[model samples]
Target chain A: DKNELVQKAKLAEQAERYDDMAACMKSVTEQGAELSNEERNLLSVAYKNVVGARRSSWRVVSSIEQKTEEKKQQMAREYREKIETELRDICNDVLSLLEKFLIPNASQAESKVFYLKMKGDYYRYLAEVAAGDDKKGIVDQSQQAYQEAFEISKKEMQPTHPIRLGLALNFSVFYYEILNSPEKACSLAKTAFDEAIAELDESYKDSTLIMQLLRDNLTLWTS
Target chain B: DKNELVQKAKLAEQAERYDDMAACMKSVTEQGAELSNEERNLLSVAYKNVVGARRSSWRVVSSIEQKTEGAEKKQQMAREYREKIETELRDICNDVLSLLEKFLIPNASQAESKVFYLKMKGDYYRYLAEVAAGDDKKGIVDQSQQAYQEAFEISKKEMQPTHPIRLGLALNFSVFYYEILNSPEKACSLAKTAFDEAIAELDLSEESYKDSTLIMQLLRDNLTLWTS
Candidate 1:
């Protein structure tokens, strides 16, 4: 019966009937059921879709924020508030999920970076609403989270992994855009960019997201 | 003189020589040469190329994401799992995205072109978010909705209510509202609207197009979700 249920869940997933899958899992678990890894994986996938949809809307607001200046400050603040409100609810719940599930699997190494980065994002959202020293304090916590993420990424992974470099570029964005620290941002971007260039095929230099992000940052920060 | 330069620059874009176009624009704009709306449109197109390229990589990642799990599960057990695939997919996406970055325009402002750019961008991010894990999730989750919203905003302004773009976006937004947000009431509201619009545009006398297009089939399937 457990095997049959798993198969059914997989089938529901293939059709994007996530609600069906969620209900099935819940119904059984309610009757003292134990789900396998695959079942949990399906549930995670459903939330990932929601998270993705939510993130896409922010860029629309971002486009408005940076594009026209006279309207930027007020519009950005309003949009940020709106995003902060919606994100807070989902992200906090996710934080709990990460803690409940991922914390036990901390030895997975990869999961640690994932959890840390999420905490960084959570802090970032909180930092937006904070005032005076408290805002700066929150940002510092975010940096600390990234630092932990970076260390774990390096210790557990090889250059072939996207974590070290990809997230580093993400860090550069956070620093330059939010922290207003161009020197640190540029230095970080260049370090990741160059380090990868040295280790990988030259072809990587031509087309990697980090490479392009590094290239963009150089122009953005330098100018 | 301006039109001639604009024409040549666009040819460079056609050849996928984005840097040449950007360089040319920089030189002209530096000299106080005013660009035509055509030039601006090209400028926008060039940047859309950039965005589109980045999305190309994400699409590849999505393919990996959608690959049948059973076919590769054993092969996957022997591997480093995410690292092996992510390394491969990241490089592929980068290459696709990079060629377009060289053609970068700061932010293309052509409303019509913006619609297409926004739609691709939205689709790319949402798909990536599905497969993206760990740190990737932090960057991309919630990233997709804006693209759809922008497409919704522009398409609504530019096209009729029943236009294909509006219908598509409405459907997507409906999915988000119902599935993600757990608001079936709102989801069904939008679905009902989309279904009605579909019927309004259908040929009352034609059955072949309905079968050929599979649109009606898809619509009926969506109706099942109405009560959800």
Candidate 2:
């Protein structure tokens, strides 16, 4: 009788009637005292198979889910590559525009001054775009772009030039909004402020005042 | 005459005139082979001081130019500092790397997936850069920022909407990036991918997957805002 019950449970499990299979297996195992050794072994095997089959059902679903995640990752990477391409094109266009507007054979000093102003504008625009989105990936990518632009500007300008102050201000904004390192942001702002104050030409005093305001905002957040 | 010569040599030596002192002492020692014991003792003392002064002057100038004793000491100290930094950085890299390997959930058959492979590669490179940079105050700051950015970029690109293997990799990257790597972007991207993937693949009416999605999203959003 136990062998018959175990055979029936295996049929139920094979037919995908899990609830019935479980009930039948439980009843056979519970009443196993009257069964022969062969009957008991058959019942045990059916019970174990039922449990394993149910567990594997969940694994099958997990595999499906994992496939979807792979697609999403592929999409995100595609988006990143697209953005990089667009930005690279923009950079080249901007460089060409600057070359067209500026005189050839300009003194290194004069050429540097013009280049700094252009790069500063580019960085400022990027900072604005980054600040608009609170998305982590967008913010990080924006900060990297801004930092790259700042590096280019520094190379072309005097370390303490007035335009350099604006670049530092842009960096401070990104550090605060994107990286969220208040100490670093404040330090960059201070550099800008000091550069403004030390300029022999007093015409750049307003630039220093703006940097002081930027530092004050960063200090408030850190506190 | 030997006694007179010794006295003059002593006076020249006191004034730091080594050449004069040595000449006088030599003459006295050579000519005064018949001199008294007191004259011999005086001449010996003056001769020794002149020779000692000449050697001391040469040593002082060499030390000043860092051509001898000081240079050797400085070089030894620098080598020790370099070794110490190297050892510390290597230990940090090993600790983080081992932890990553331990927590990595086996993808089973999905191990060959490109996204899964790239996530692992990104982490390995980020940790390699960190170990090279070391743990000095400035080095730590610079390396930490660079490592975090690498992790962030990788997480953002690798996370996807339906693959548990991809989701698992993202989750693993996020947890390590947030806690050990100190990166919010990496953490948030991982969490967001897990949430989005769960919603798309799992039956929302099912309690288990629904709960997982909610918990993952909450954790991700909280970390993203908190870090910002």
Candidate 3:
């Protein structure tokens, strides 16, 4: 049953055929049962690859030469709107799955942190396309999601845990890049980096790698 | 000068960095002179790579899935993904057409080079036609038709029967007619006529006839398959 679907989904992911992975994972999610963290990861990977291209294209189209002319200007505006619509739709689609399915069914504290971070990530993605009050609203929601994840991760996960370090890494990036508050970004990352260094077991490659990223971002933002 | 840009474009192409290749070629085309055949080939190659993966993913996502309740969600997601891909594809197709119309064709000096770029213009439009829907498809197909016809007319007047550019033009034009236009008779007639004329000019001893003759075999092969 679902094992076959998951087997195929994993195979498709291994082959980098994300469309099939998406279809398989959709069917798996439709089975109306709680998913393992691995299944949730597959679902995230599938939609990320599917929607990532549109996000990139939106940025490129949005940055295109404006004030050029009547026809070209209209084309660029329309193309930007088209890509924005798709990006917004995909973001909302995953957001619904998060709220309705993934987050509600998550049993493990680690899974809860992972899905909450994803919630923040997708909202941040929406903020990239939104404007005015709408953008500020999405940013607020994203900050709330990240804050929840950050607090829970700090209590539940160890300082050197990959999930804890990753939440810290992205939360810092959220402040630096999205909120435009480098001080908060640097302080958050610096705290995480220092805490991790005190408990740092170089044996955990993922934790060390995330710790390195947090340090790098601290260096980048401070300088 | 231009050589440096062309060399960079070639290197970028070799590294599969088509965006860099495109920028390099854009600089090459901005040099206020006609492009060499190699430069023209590189320009097409760069854009082809840039557009190729999106095209492939679009095709994969458009394929039909099995029927069920959750299948509806799958189909909806696939449709959304395909729409996003089409937007990106249409943008790139427009960029290529703009380059061909605004810079490449006007700067092309010889009739051969003009025809070469014109065929490319048509080919890129046909690519748009591949994903375009409803009225959009009709508009794109009309543009491609006009482009291919203009190049075909020029090739007929300026190039010899055995010219590779001319033969390649015929091969692609006939395929356009068959695949895009749904006109097998016209496609067969066009291919048959081009093949006959090329065979009439065929000289076994001529070293330059190899490329032209190879394309002629493809034309005949298509003709045979279509006629059957």
**Could you tell me the lDDT of residue B26 within candidate 1?**
45
Best by lDDT: 3
Question: DockQ of each candidate's interface versus the true one?
Answer: 0.01, 0.00, 0.03
- Tens digits of per-residue lDDT, candidate 2, A42-147, equal 4334434543432333233333334665444343343334433444444334434334432232345434444444444444333333335445654554555456
lDDT of 2 at B5: 65
Instruction: Compare the candidates by DockQ and give the number of the best one.
Output: 3
Sort by TM-score, best first: what order?
A: 3, 1, 2
Q: Relative to the unseen true structure, what is the C-alpha lDDT of residue A46 in candidate 2, on a scale of 0 to 100?
A: 46
Q: Which portions of model 2 show Cα errors greater than 4 Å?
A: A1-160, A195-202, B1-228
Models 1 onward score TM values of: 0.39, 0.22, 0.55
Q: What is the interface RMSD of each candidate, in Å?
A: 13.9, 47.2, 10.4
lDDT of 1 by residue, A1-223 (tens): 5554555455445534444455554443344433344655564565455444345545545555556666334545565456556656655665565555554455567667755765676566555455677788878977888788888887886654565666677677778767888898999888887777777753344347667767787887786
Q: What's the ranking of the predictions by DockQ, best on top? A: 3, 1, 2
lDDT for position B52 in model 2? 40
Cα lDDT tens digits, model 3, A1-223, are 8877886676466545677788888788877778887888899899899778777776666665254554545556765786688788888878888888788888889989999998999998898888777888999999999999999998898899888898899888899889999889999999998998888434598988998898888777765
Q: What's the CA error at residue B45 for candidate 1, in Å?
A: 26
RMSD of candidate 2 to the true fold? 41.0
Off by over 4 Å in 3: A65-71, A201-203, B1-47, B50-228
Error of 3 at B156 (Å): 19
